[PDB]
């Protein structure tokens, strides 16, 4: 869905760091904590919140709106022509609202590459373009 992903589609290799920003679009009155975790390649999805906490993680409270940008250390295509990172989101706490606030709110995820990111072997892949008539 990201421009980054679509631009990788025109290339073969890439390497660098990534940023993913999570934006909470709930009510102002809503509050709670999420646990965002990144699992490096080879590693399995952490079985529970507790073991996810033992690794790289950010505990995100809604005293801070969206200012949670997770940084993914390194991505690589030394092979591609559990071998990828893993980013998990857990409820640290339940979702808390007073009377009158919606009991469901949505998160928007934005992602991009850092300035150390580079792509290498140019390669055209496609969907379509109209035929002659």
């Amino acid at each position: 869905s990201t421009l980054l992903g679509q631009l990788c589609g025109y290339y073969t290799q890439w390497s660098g760091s990534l940023e993913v920003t999570f934006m909470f679009t709930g009510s102002f009155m809503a509050t709670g904590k999420m646990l965002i975790a990144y699992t490096p390649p080879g590693g399995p999805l952490p079985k529970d919140r507790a073991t996810a906490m033992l690794g790289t993680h950010v505990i995100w409270d809604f005293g801070l709106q969206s200012s949670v940008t997770l940084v993914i250390p390194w991505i690589s295509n030394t092979h591609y022509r559990y071998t990828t990172g893993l980013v998990s989101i857990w409820y640290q706490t339940n979702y808390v609202v007073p009377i009158g606030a919606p009991n469901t709110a949505y998160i928007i995820a934005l992602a991009a590459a850092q300035k150390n990111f580079t792509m290498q072997l140019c390669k055209d892949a496609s969907d379509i373009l109209q035929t002659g008539t």
Binding site: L3, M23, T25, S27, G100, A105
Partner: protein
């Protein structure tokens, strides 16, 4: 406690919000030191009368709203003194201060993406499953000051993914965090001057990415107010009669 006034029309405003002001492509609107002949009859640079605070009719945000768009300078093409200049001139050039604002309670919910897309060409349906090339009417390509609603926000009514609309100059309006957004737009064209009534240099998109929500009893519609002010408007042309 702050009242920002520029001209004859005055507006009360909170600024600069969560992320300050967005200047499109890191470039302020400028007059044109360069273009084009330059001749004696050359541009007419008005202000502050014409370049004032224009506030469009407010739009009502609903749980089911798909989004709206406006075309520039088509919106003000019939509005006040700017509308007058744009119609009875041959060549046109301008920048814009676009200001989008919500009024909502701390018990309301939602997120708008406010963006500016240069040369926003519309594509309509060719049949739900089929290939019939019909092109949008004026009511859809140049919807005037009242704007137009998106039919398919996901593809921005042009086969183009809204998930990547943030490549364009943009600001988020998250009711939780901020209620207003400001975008500064320079003149963008492959020519220094163009027709105000026949060419829309850019479109203004306002699309809910996270739907409006509330418990029942709260105001079911949230107002989106748009104030825009031309900045380095320049009118060459001369005389005309429409």
């Amino acid at each position: 406690d702050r009242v920002a006034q520029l001209t004859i029309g005055n507006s009360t405003i909170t600024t600069q919000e969560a992320a300050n002001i967005i200047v499109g492509y890191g470039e302020w609107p400028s007059y044109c030191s360069d273009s084009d002949a330059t001749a004696v009859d050359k541009p007419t640079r008005p202000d502050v009368s014409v370049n004032r605070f224009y506030t469009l009719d407010t739009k009502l945000w609903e749980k089911s709203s798909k989004g709206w768009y406006w075309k520039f300078p088509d919106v003000l093409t019939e509005t006040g003194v700017f509308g007058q200049n744009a119609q009875f001139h041959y060549l046109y050039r301008s920048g814009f201060c676009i200001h989008v604002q919500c009024n909502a309670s701390k018990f309301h919910q939602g997120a708008l993406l406010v963006a500016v897309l240069p040369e926003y060409v519309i594509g309509t349906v060719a049949g739900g499953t089929g290939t019939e090339d019909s092109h949008p009417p004026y009511k859809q390509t140049q919807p005037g000051a009242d704007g137009f609603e998106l039919q398919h926000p996901y593809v921005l009514d042009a086969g183009i993914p809204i998930s990547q609309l943030t490549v364009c100059p943009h600001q988020w309006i998250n009711l939780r965090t901020n209620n207003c957004a400001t975008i500064i737009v320079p003149y963008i064209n492959a020519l220094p001057f163009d027709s105000a009534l026949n060419h829309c240099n850019f479109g203004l998109l306002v699309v809910p990415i996270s739907p409006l929500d509330y418990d029942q009893g709260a105001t079911p519609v949230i107002p989106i107010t748009i104030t825009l002010a031309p900045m380095c408007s320049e009118f060459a042309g001369l005389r005309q009669a429409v």
